[PDB]
Symmetry: C2
Subunit: 281 residues, 2 copies
């Protein structure tokens, strides 16, 4: 054993409000350290198909396993490591009946809970700022919305489901499009797939003279640092990134040391954070 | 050579808007990789005096050098590595005539520039939300303010220099204290030592019915992601964290490989980011 776990992360877009690198990596580093392991960061290949670096690290004997993040459908990195029978844990699922060790956050449960909360306040025209169809995480989160709306038997309007990049600009543009609707057809609540989008929605609401919360409710996703300081403070879905980090290391170390548990699929639940004038419940 | 550089970072307080771990570490990882080196993260000891982990990593031969961040005055880690004659580069100075290799951002120049800008708009009552006296970075940044005010020959009021923790709560409290002053004595502009503080100031201004920018100008520090999305968007001092990361690796690799340059002190300049209704200049 080299007592080292290889890790890499996708380049953070300049303009994204959330950076869970700190929560995830810090957590892994401290957890690994407790059991005498080190996390070895290596350059990420934006073209996930290029697995050369993985190939190199394996035969160099510099690591005993890998932790993968930013998992897409049919992830080439997952395919490769599976073929090589090399130890690894993916932080995020990929392809339904594709088998391997993983830790993930129940995105679906997150949005479902958020939507149920809005319905519980009496909201009936709820829209969502979602992501493209090729996004695994996006579909999970969107699914929760569909389920909650279906269960409450509320209309699921195609005009209320806008797909695009998770940016401030897109969030704002899509919301302005929705606010262009008359009071009768305009949604009273908007669910977004990340806080950056929610901020754009807040900007759009402000531009159109609507009071956030009262006239237009907004719930984001990933409870990025500082969203709590906005006015009104932003309600959002928080994911247990630190715990997920700890679970990844914990599961990979067990696999690397030959004592793989029967529970190689760890699904963690997110928490809905509702914020009012001050303090969240 | 082990071709590995050890690095560790202080635990990010829950509630801080900026996380330069991503900019700094990502940059180091990619730079090291280009010259065949890896960055090896190890658990940070909040009690900087406890240098055991450094002692262990050196004789284990697992690293050829270290990069240090969160440098305080008379930093025990710097003292130790200096005694051990072990390669290291500090990201941040410590103790004036204390000698060693380092890369740092000219904090003083950052605030001076910010204050000069405010004076250039005609501001004469400018206050600052600063940090405690035992903060090396705090004193550097505060120094720039004093210099600019002194140069423009404007009053340097003790009532306008409030020291405390760089939090939202403190920034807000200190600003409300300042806004308690009548229009005649109230400052027209506020400089803060980090964006978290500036956000609190923005919250205070909002609570007291003042238009940010027009009635009360605010300039923060570290241009954390998303401050650009606030209303009004927040002007702030940006530091070249990625470049600093690259310079650290670059300087340490040279020292580790026996070809230490004569320029072992690298001081980088920050940039003032002025933002208006949309787009920054």
């Amino acid at each position: 054993l080299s007592f080292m776990i290889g890790y890499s992360w996708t380049q953070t877009e300049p303009g994204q409000v959330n950076h869970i690198l700190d929560q995830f990596l810090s957590s892994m580093v401290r957890e690994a350290g407790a059991v005498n392991y080190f996390v070895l960061p290596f350059p990420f290949s934006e073209d996930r198909s290029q697995i050369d670096i993985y190939r190199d690290l394996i035969r160099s004997g510099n690591v005993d396993g890998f932790v993968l993040s930013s998992i897409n459908y049919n992830d080439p990195r997952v395919q490769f490591l599976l073929k090589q029978k090399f130890p690894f844990v993916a932080f995020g699922r990929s392809n339904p009946d594709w088998d391997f060790a993983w830790v993930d956050i129940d995105g679906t449960a997150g949005t479902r809970q958020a939507v149920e909360y809005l319905i519980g306040r009496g909201h009936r025209r709820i829209a969502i700022l979602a992501w493209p169809e090729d996004s695994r995480v996006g579909n999970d989160r969107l699914q929760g919305y569909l389920e909650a709306m279906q269960t409450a038997q509320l209309p699921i309007e195609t005009g209320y489901i806008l797909r695009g990049e998770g940016t401030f600009e897109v969030g704002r543009a899509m919301t302005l499009h929705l606010l262009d609707l008359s009071p009768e057809r305009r949604p009273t609540a908007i669910m977004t797939l990340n806080d950056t989008m929610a901020i754009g929605a807040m900007a759009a609401a402000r531009e159109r003279g609507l009071t956030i919360g009262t006239d237009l409710a907004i719930i984001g996703f990933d409870d990025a640092p500082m969203v709590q300081y906005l006015f009104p403070p932003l309600s959002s879905v928080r994911q247990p990134i630190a715990e997920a980090g700890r679970k990844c290391i914990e599961l990979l170390v067990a696999i690397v040391e030959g004592r793989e548990p029967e529970q190689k699929h760890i699904l963690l639940q997110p928490s809905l954070i509702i914020r009012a004038s001050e303090g969240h419940h």
